[PDB]
Every structure is written in structure tokens, then in C-alpha cells.
Amino acid sequence: DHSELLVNTKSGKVMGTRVPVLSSHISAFLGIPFAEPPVGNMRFRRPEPKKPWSGVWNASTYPNNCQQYVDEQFPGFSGSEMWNPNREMSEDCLYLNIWVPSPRPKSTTVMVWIYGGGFYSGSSTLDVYNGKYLAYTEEVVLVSLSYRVGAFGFLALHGSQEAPGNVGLLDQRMALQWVHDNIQFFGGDPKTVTIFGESAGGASVGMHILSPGSRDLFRRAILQSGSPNCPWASVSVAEGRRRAVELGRNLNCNLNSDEELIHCLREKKPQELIDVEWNVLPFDSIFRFSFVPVIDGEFFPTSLESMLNSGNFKKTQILLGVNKDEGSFFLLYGAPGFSKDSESKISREDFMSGVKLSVPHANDLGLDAVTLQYTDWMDDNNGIKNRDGLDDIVGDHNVICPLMHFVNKYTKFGNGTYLYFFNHRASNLVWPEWMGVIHGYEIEFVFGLPLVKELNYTAEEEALSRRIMHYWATFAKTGNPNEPHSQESKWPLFTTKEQKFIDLNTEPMKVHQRLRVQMCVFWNQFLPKLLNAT
Amino acid sequence: DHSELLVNTKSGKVMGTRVPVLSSHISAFLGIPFAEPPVGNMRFRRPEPKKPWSGVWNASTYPNNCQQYVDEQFPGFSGSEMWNPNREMSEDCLYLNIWVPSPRPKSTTVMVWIYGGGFYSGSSTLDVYNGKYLAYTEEVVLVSLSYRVGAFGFLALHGSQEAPGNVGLLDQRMALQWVHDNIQFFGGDPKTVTIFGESAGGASVGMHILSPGSRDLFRRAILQSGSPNCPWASVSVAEGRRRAVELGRNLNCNLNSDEELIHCLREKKPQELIDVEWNVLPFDSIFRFSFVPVIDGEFFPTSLESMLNSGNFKKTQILLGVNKDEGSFFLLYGAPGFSKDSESKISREDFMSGVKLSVPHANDLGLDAVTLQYTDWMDDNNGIKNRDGLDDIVGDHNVICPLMHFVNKYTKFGNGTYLYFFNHRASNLVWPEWMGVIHGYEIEFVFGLPLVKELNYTAEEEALSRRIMHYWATFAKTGNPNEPHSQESKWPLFTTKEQKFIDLNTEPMKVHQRLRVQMCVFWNQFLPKLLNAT
Ligand SMILES: O=C(NCCCCCCNc1c2c(nc3ccccc13)CCCC2)c1cccnc1
Ligand SMILES: O=C(NCCCCCCNc1c2c(nc3ccccc13)CCCC2)c1cccnc1
Ligand SMILES: *[C@@H]1O[C@H](CO)[C@@H](O[C@@H]2O[C@H](CO)[C@@H](O)[C@H](O)[C@H]2NC(C)=O)[C@H](O)[C@H]1NC(C)=O
Ligand SMILES: *[C@@H]1O[C@H](CO)[C@@H](O[C@@H]2O[C@H](CO)[C@@H](O)[C@H](O)[C@H]2NC(C)=O)[C@H](O)[C@H]1NC(C)=O
Ligand SMILES: *[C@@H]1O[C@H](CO)[C@@H](O)[C@H](O)[C@H]1NC(C)=O
Ligand SMILES: *[C@@H]1O[C@H](CO)[C@@H](O)[C@H](O)[C@H]1NC(C)=O
């Protein structure tokens, strides 16, 4: 050994950089490779492990982001623009980032972040995913992995071994492997690794909890606004086949064999794949993505619901939750009548339209039930109600009810569940009032940005961020977000019988029960039963 | 002419009796025949008109009640016992009763009452149907007809002319004919006849509004807690056939022809028919009756819904409404978990049971939708909620939503609609708190019993009765329950656009809109659509 910023791993040596944080400093190691570049012929394949290197890998700057579609709806607007790649995209994007306390701990708690973005987008290197605040403030080692999104990560021709499906998940698995293997050298305790993530990252987390090949490589888990059974999170192998074929068909490929097709898709430049990515969708829809995990028989041995039922999953502690207004962002981008700069009150006819796109797989009787459950018939041309009703349809259907079924099935077999409902709307939020508490807007609180005065949060917003960070980290370190025998208010355990949960906001903690049961009984029991019979 | 109590009609002379009322007196003519006894061979046939008589028919005492099943669930208990025949039953029961002001008016407004009782029971002669208070207080001529209930009134073998169906309705028609023809001699104005009725009588009223052969014989109409499209009010000709056959089968009849069967059913004593009346029902159910009107092609030319749609009905003014807790009486008598002497809180499993019996014609997905619409899933073992939820299911499904669809269809084509929601619970009510405001308990207020001090109502209950009687009679006399240019609060007209209605109770009038729309959209639009597809 020689110095604080030089760490030797099983893959080689690695030189970090000293990084400032809230009038102190910590070490940071950025863009460490954990896989061979999945380039040329390796596109669509499994990740291979990174060949070890001689010399000193310079880990002082963030790596390239994976190739992905780029938001251009509000150019220069920070609200949308903060989610885009802030680094040059490249297929050579399988790297991770480590923030580490100064001085180097010996065996501290590890937290590994898994970004969202519908499995079609996402970056480890964004500002909101910066781990220096969490690492500093809570004394954890913070890791952010990456994984291939889009067709590059999720094109599935089941049966073929060139493009099996799921490889973006295997990407994440392998970075977890790499942490299990090397994190001790950074002072991490590999027996005490929490994976955590939001959206597609929250569903990923749950996917690793479900998948055998992934369960041994982490200790605990946090799922934010996503769960592995969301209707957008996975597709049958038949559906993925259809879609890969349809992709080939948009690029004038030979389709008569897996071999010809893959060969063709591999001839292509990345942006050509992205240019037609969205055209493979079976339905006109929102909150649906083209290349997602497949239920293959390997990564997932059986269907998800049967795995949840039969207890076939890792049994450990989990902490998860949702945000008040999960759906708003989807309707803004994808639904008639919603604009960023307007109150977006919605005609009844735009309502009808919205429902159709929000529950794409529904026959007419379906749409009638969904519409009936969500319409105050005493006051049905209220455009605020129509607006807000549809907001809720999207979030209930896509995020909250799937998470709530996940929770109920998991807690039968598990060892501890802590549920939250995050409903603070930030004082500095650039988006309009109507979108409420938006998909992804608990993140900044999880990653500590309210402590950075220049980002202009309130003090009570700072205080909520420190509270949340300490819930998240205490939980990662112990299986419980509460600190033993302390005067603070207690986040009760969530149990099959009483179903408790807490709001997360600036007001004194309040405990509640049965998070959106009424609606989620509609989405999780009745609707599905109705579409099965008809 | 000779005296106040001797009236000469087209059928003969008739001697009334002078009857006391609230420290005054009026004339009354009871048990005047309007049809030949439908006895022996005439059983199940059309009514023939009464052969005129010589001499002076003694109209001083009530007639016989029609043959009918008799309530014995609470023997001696006045609550149930006040609905039973208070006169000897006989098949020779086609008579009417007339209360007339003293002195005899020359051309006053006429009101003709049509009793309820599921078309299986009812009497013109009950205490609550006594017209002397209404006649005296409001200066109307009050008529009460009767009609055959049970198989005697409603056995249907469509195609046959011995037992066509519907004859109990023709009974009522004929008493209306008789009023059109003779009421002038009692000082009634035959151009100004309101028919009115409750339950099966309310549905009858609407049935005469719908039926061509009946529409010319009245001016206006009031429907209390019933409407002609209630699901218990009518059956197909196939269903009525099945049921008449099944009746024969319970009495060991020959079933190979209409002729043999009818011959057989006519051999029988009345009580034999009543003894097995209830065994013909297709389903285990509540709020369902064995012999009811059939949709025959004659009395009703086409199906009810098509008649309502196409405007094929009498266009005049109507005044109608419902009571807060229509269903309670049905669940008391017919549903597990409900007792007269208990708070009747209901297990969830008794709930399930209740729903099954309340919506008999529902497949499992039906029962799931009904259960979902009516269960607070935040608090689902609340036995008061389960009790009250099912109360509402019965009243919504059977009384309120059918009336609300009737109203909406009628008001497109009609000339004035006045809707009420009667929700006063009487201070002297003998039934328990939980049954709330019960099916048939607006009647006593319509017939003025609160003015009779010895019945122990409050003064504000007296005042509500006088108010209601004057709404009912002003409406019969004018087409509007409101008196021109008067300081009183105004019962607004009910219109397609704004759907207004008033509560009827002791508190100052309150106007509302859209009576149980949310539920009735479930019952009138969605549920039926759901059972049609599945
Ligand atoms: O560029 C276009 N569409 C881009 C669609 C990509 C959307 C990226 C999503 N990024 C977000 C993400 C999250 N929340 C958001 C909240 C508000 C806005 C964006 C959020 C949370 C999960 C990570 C991504 C386009 C298409 C057609 C016409 N005009 C623009
Ligand atoms: O006798 C039995 N059941 C009789 C069923 C007949 C029910 C007659 C209905 N009479 C009522 C009627 C109305 N409201 C009522 C409210 C409370 C109670 C009775 C009401 C209003 C419409 C006219 C009839 C019986 C059956 C089996 C076991 N125990 C008793
Ligand atoms: C999680 O699992 C642990 C052990 O697998 C549980 O701890 C045990 O609880 C049982 C039942 O009360 C006790 O008899 C044992 O003594 C406990 N073992 C240990 C080592 O403490 C624990 O209850 C589970 N926690 C939850 C929240 O389900
Ligand atoms: C009921 O019908 C009568 C006539 O059939 C309506 O009275 C007419 O209303 C029209 C339209 O406003 C006027 O132009 C006529 O002058 C009225 N005729 C008479 C004789 O007054 C009445 O509007 C209808 N009422 C309701 C409540 O629909
Ligand atoms: C590491 O690389 C960066 C970025 O290109 C550079 O600024 C820095 O000086 C480098 N340091 C070493 C030791 O290579
Ligand atoms: C009318 O009949 C009743 C009842 O049977 C009787 O009390 C009364 O005296 C009779 N009067 C006449 C005139 O027949």
C-alpha cells in the first residue's frame, strides 16, 4: 500500500480522486470497469468479466453512459434535462463508481445504487445520483453500477445464445459480483450490501430478490417506486421475440433466422437502433417500454406471480415505497390535454383517451370499469378531477398497486418490511403544481441534495433529507431504519395483519394502514379477473 | 235525488255511511263492485264488468280482501300485522272505496290509490290506506281500488285466453274505467284523476302510463318506491309459463296442455295455491315474487326499455320518489344475520350470502363487482358497514336505481317531473333503529295518520304530513305540488339537465341533484353490460 486514493483489487490497481463535500472531503473512484466492453459481436450477449489490468487504472472521472434515447421535449429545461446522459454515450459503458469515506473505513456498510429509466435509459453519472453526500453524511460506501438499457440490454430471442434476453440484468448481477469480490479493499463489508433503486431500478432490485443466480450477492434491499411485477417491467418470451423481429423489420433485416437477424442488428450503428426503438410496441400506450426483461425460464425460473406465491425468493429485510403522484410525468409526455405550462385540466373526452392509453391491454368493459372506479359522477365535467383522476389511474396501475401486491406476497415469507409513502412537494420544484409529487423526486432527498445550500431547499427540507438518508443507511447497516432505543418517532414494521406504513414529508411522522387498498383491490383482484373471463 | 249518502251511478244506486274525521264528518262508500266476481271458471280470466244492480247496494262496510299469503313472522306485532288483510279473504274481492267531502263537491279533484305488496299481497282496506284524512284535509275525492294478487291475478300461460297473464292489472284498469265513468256522481271530476301507489302499486301506476289500453283513463300519476322497470316487477312470457307449469307440478296436475293445467288449477281451493306459491321461483333470492306482470305483447306492446326509449308512453306530469332505506325489510325477512330484535351486525360471510340472494341473476364476476362497489376495504370487518352496505344494495338494485332510470327516460318526453327522497324516521316507529326509513313508511304520512293525536306522532311530524298531503293533492289538482305565488319553499321541477330533487323530512326543505347517481350508474349501466358480455 502507498496512499488513500490507491486501492488494489483483484482486477488491478485503481487511482481515485479526492472530492470535496460540505466543507470536508472524501475519496471517490469513478468509471472502474467490471465487464469486457460489450461491443461488436458481443452486442446482445452476456457480459464477460473484465480482464484484469496491469498498471494503474485512472478512476478520477465518470465513465461513458450507455447508448440510449434522449429526452428533447423541453430543451435546456432542467426538470427533464437532469435525467439525460451528462456524458458521451458509448456501447462501452459497463463501469461503476465508488464513493468512500475519508479516512478509509475497514469494514463499513455498502450501498449499491441501480438507476431507473424504463430499462430504455438511465445513467450512473447524473447529479441526483451523486453518492458523496450519502457516503459522507452516513459513513457508508456508496456504489453506483450501470447496465445496458434498450435493445442493447434487453433484446430477446429466447433459444438463441447470441441474444438470450435479460443481459442488462446480468450486467447488474456482475457488478454485484464485482462488489462481493472487491469491495473489502475500499473498506466495504461485503456481508452487508444493500441494493437499492428507483423505477426500473426498483423493479431490478426485486428481480434480483426473485432470481436465484442473484440472491447470494446482496444482503438487503430497498425498492423506490418500482417492483418486479409492474406490468411494464417484463414480457413473455413470445412478446420479446415478436418485438425483436419487428425491430429487425424496421431496419430491413433478413428475418428467416435468429442468426441472420442478430447478425443484421449487430451491423448497425447504435443510433439506428434507437431511431426505431419505439415502433415495436404492440399498443398505443403510456408507461410502456420496448425492451424489457423477459420471463425466460433461467433468470426467472417460473412466472413472477408463482414465484411470489410459492415463496420462491430471497428472504431478508426490505424497505420500499411510493410517491404521491407517480403518473403525472407519463401523461405530460404521452397523453392529450396535458402540457408543462398549463394547469392541464382535462376534457371528459381527453379523459376517455387517457384511460385507453393507460390501460392498453383492456377490452371495452375494462375501460368502463376503470372509468367507473375513477369518476365522481356527481361532478363529472370537473377538469381538475378528470386531470387528477387519471394521474392516479396511471400511478395506481403502474406503480402503487403492483408494489402493494409485491409487498403483501413478500411479507408472508420475509424477515421485515418497512413501507413509505413519500408525499413532499419540493419548494424549488421546476415542474408545475399539477404534476404533484413526481416519479423520481424522492431521489434528491435520498441522495442528500437539500444539504447543498445553493440548490435552494428549505431547512425543513434539509432536515427531511438527513432523516431519510439515515433511515436508508441505518436500514442498510441493520435491517431496520430505526436506531435502537432512541427518542425519535418509530417507523413501524409492516405486517401481514396490520399493514402499517408512514408518510415521508416535513410534518411529524404519521403512521397509516392499508396503502390505497380500495383502488389496489380494483387493480390487483377485480380488473384482472374481469379481463380473464371476457 | 234524496240525500248526501245516496248516489246513483250507471251501475245502480249505492248507500254510503257518514264517517267521523278530526271533529268533523264526511261521506264514505265502501265495497262498491266494479267487476263480476272472478270465481269458478273465471279464475285467471279477464275481469268482466259488473252487471248493473236493482235496488240500493249497501256501501257502509269494507269489502273482502283478495286471497293472498299472510305474514306470520311476528304474530301480534303491529309493524308486520298492519300490512295483512284486516278482512276475510275471498276470491270475490273486486271492489273499490270512495271517500267524499261533506258537503258533496260538484267537480273536485280525484285521487285513486293502488296498493302494493309485491303483486302477491295487499288490501284496499288497511288502516294506513284510509282516505278520510286526505279527503277531508285536502278536499279531494279519494278512491282505493283492489286487484287480484298472486296466481289469481298473475298466472301467465301466454297464448291461452283462459289464463293470459296480467289480469290483476286489467282489474285495476277496469276500476279506473269505472271511475272515468261514475266518479262525477260522487262529485269527482273525471278529467282530473291522479293514480297513485307504492311498491307494486308504484310500478302498476307506471305500467298504466306505459300501456296504451290504460293511458286514456287517468290524468296524472304519482309513483312511491316503485317503477315499472324494477327487476321484480315483470317477467318474460317464457318465465311465466315455466312458473305456472311449476305451480301445476306442485299440485300434481296434468301438464300436457294449457287446458288440462288450468282446469286443474281451477279445481283447487285458494289456500292450496298459496301453500306452494313460493316454490316456483327460479333462484334463491330476496325481493322476488312468483306471479307478476308479463311482457305479453298486448298490455305491453314491446319490452319496457324499448318503450321508455322510443317515448312510447303517456306524456303528462309525474311525481315520484323513494325512501332512504328501502331494502331493510327484505333482509330482515329473507337474509341470514338480520333479526328484528338485534342490531343485526353482519359477519363478512353473511355479507357474501346477502349479496348472492340480493342479485340472484349474477354470475361470480357480478357478485365480485357488486361486493367491490359496496365494501370499504379500509375497514371490511365493520359489521355495521356490512349491515348498512347490504341494506343499500337491496334498495339501490330493487327500488332506487330502477326508479332513477325510469325518471331519466320519462323526463325526456314528459311534461313535468317532481322527485323526492323521503328520509324521516318516525318517532313512534315500532321496528328497530337499523332498518332505518323503511319500505312503505312514507305512506302513513301521505294518508295523514300524524294528525290523529292518539297515534302519538310529534307536532313537527303532523306538520310534515300536512305538507306532504298538500304537495300530493295540489299536484293532483294542477300538475304541480307547489301553490302559485306563495311564500313557501319551492319544490323545483326535475329536468334532464340539472336533475333536482328534494328531501322530505322535518328539516327545512333542501334541494339536491343526481339522486344516487354513483351507485345507480353501477346498477343501470355497468353491471348489466358486465353480465351481458359474460
Ligand atoms: O424526447 C422525447 N421524449 C423523451 C421521453 C424520455 C423521458 C425521460 C424520463 N426522465 C424522467 C425519469 C424520472 N422522472 C422524470 C420526471 C419528469 C420528467 C422526466 C423524468 C424518474 C425515472 C428516471 C427517468 C420526445 C418525444 C416526442 C416528442 N417530443 C419529445
Ligand atoms: O309469514 C312469513 N313471511 C311473510 C312475508 C310477507 C311480508 C309482507 C310485507 N309487508 C310489508 C309491506 C311493506 N312494507 C313492510 C315493511 C315492514 C314489514 C312488512 C312490510 C310495504 C309494501 C306492502 C307490504 C314467514 C315465512 C317464513 C318464516 N316465517 C314467516
Ligand atoms: C427474522 O428472522 C429471525 C431469525 O431467522 C427472527 O428471529 C427469531 O425470532 C424467533 C421467533 O420469535 C425467536 O424465537 C428467535 O429467538 C429469533 N432468533 C434470533 C437469532 O433472534 C426474527 O423474528 C425475524 N424477524 C421478523 C421481523 O420477521
Ligand atoms: C308541458 O306542455 C305544455 C304544452 O303542451 C307546455 O306549455 C307550452 O310551453 C311552450 C314552450 O315554452 C310555450 O311556447 C307554450 O306557450 C306553452 N303552452 C301553453 C298552453 O302554456 C309546457 O312548457 C310543458 N311543461 C313542461 C314542464 O315541460
Ligand atoms: C486522470 O485523467 C483525467 C481526465 O482526462 C486528467 O485530468 C488527470 O490529470 C489524470 N490523472 C492521471 C494520474 O492520469
Ligand atoms: C248495512 O250493512 C251493515 C253490515 O252488515 C249493517 O250494520 C247496517 O245496519 C246495514 N244498513 C243497511 C241500510 O242495510
Short mmCIF file of C-alpha atoms in Angstrom, two decimals, chain B residues 78-80 82-83 113 126-134 137 196 198 224-225 323 420 422 424-431 436-452 455-458 461-469 472:
data_model
loop_
_atom_site.label_atom_id
_atom_site.label_comp_id
_atom_site.label_asym_id
_atom_site.label_seq_id
_atom_site.Cartn_x
_atom_site.Cartn_y
_atom_site.Cartn_z
CA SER B 78 -98.27 -4.28 14.68
CA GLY B 79 -95.32 -3.48 12.32
CA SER B 80 -95.96 -6.52 10.13
CA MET B 82 -100.72 -3.69 9.76
CA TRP B 83 -100.00 -4.95 6.21
CA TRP B 113 -104.87 4.62 -4.73
CA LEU B 126 -105.96 -1.36 5.66
CA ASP B 127 -105.75 1.39 8.31
CA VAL B 128 -102.79 3.15 6.64
CA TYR B 129 -104.74 3.26 3.35
CA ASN B 130 -107.76 5.01 4.93
CA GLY B 131 -108.64 8.07 2.77
CA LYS B 132 -110.80 10.06 5.14
CA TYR B 133 -107.92 12.28 6.34
CA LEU B 134 -106.66 13.15 2.86
CA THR B 137 -107.99 17.79 4.77
CA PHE B 196 -101.00 6.83 -7.15
CA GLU B 198 -96.46 2.39 -3.59
CA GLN B 224 -93.91 5.91 -4.44
CA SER B 225 -90.99 3.48 -4.10
CA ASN B 323 -87.28 6.17 0.85
CA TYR B 420 -88.48 13.30 -3.66
CA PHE B 422 -88.23 10.61 1.86
CA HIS B 424 -87.76 10.86 8.04
CA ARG B 425 -87.69 8.05 10.64
CA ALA B 426 -90.84 8.23 12.70
CA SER B 427 -90.65 8.88 16.43
CA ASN B 428 -93.17 6.09 17.15
CA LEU B 429 -91.73 3.52 14.80
CA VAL B 430 -92.08 0.00 16.25
CA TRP B 431 -89.29 -1.52 14.15
CA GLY B 436 -83.89 3.00 9.06
CA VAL B 437 -86.57 4.58 6.87
CA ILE B 438 -88.48 1.51 5.64
CA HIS B 439 -90.24 0.45 2.51
CA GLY B 440 -93.85 1.68 2.95
CA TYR B 441 -93.28 4.08 5.83
CA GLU B 442 -93.95 7.25 3.82
CA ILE B 443 -97.49 6.03 3.34
CA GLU B 444 -98.73 6.95 6.80
CA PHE B 445 -97.52 10.48 6.04
CA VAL B 446 -99.23 10.53 2.69
CA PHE B 447 -102.53 9.36 4.30
CA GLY B 448 -102.44 11.78 7.17
CA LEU B 449 -102.14 9.47 10.24
CA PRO B 450 -99.92 12.00 12.15
CA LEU B 451 -102.93 14.25 12.51
CA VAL B 452 -104.59 11.60 14.69
CA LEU B 455 -101.17 7.59 17.19
CA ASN B 456 -98.57 9.55 19.07
CA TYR B 457 -96.61 11.38 16.35
CA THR B 458 -94.83 14.69 17.17
CA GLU B 461 -94.48 15.08 12.22
CA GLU B 462 -98.06 16.33 11.92
CA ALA B 463 -96.74 19.34 10.09
CA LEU B 464 -94.79 17.18 7.62
CA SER B 465 -97.84 15.04 6.96
CA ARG B 466 -99.99 18.15 6.16
CA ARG B 467 -97.22 19.48 3.93
CA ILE B 468 -96.93 16.19 2.05
CA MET B 469 -100.70 15.74 1.69
CA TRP B 472 -99.72 15.33 -3.29
#
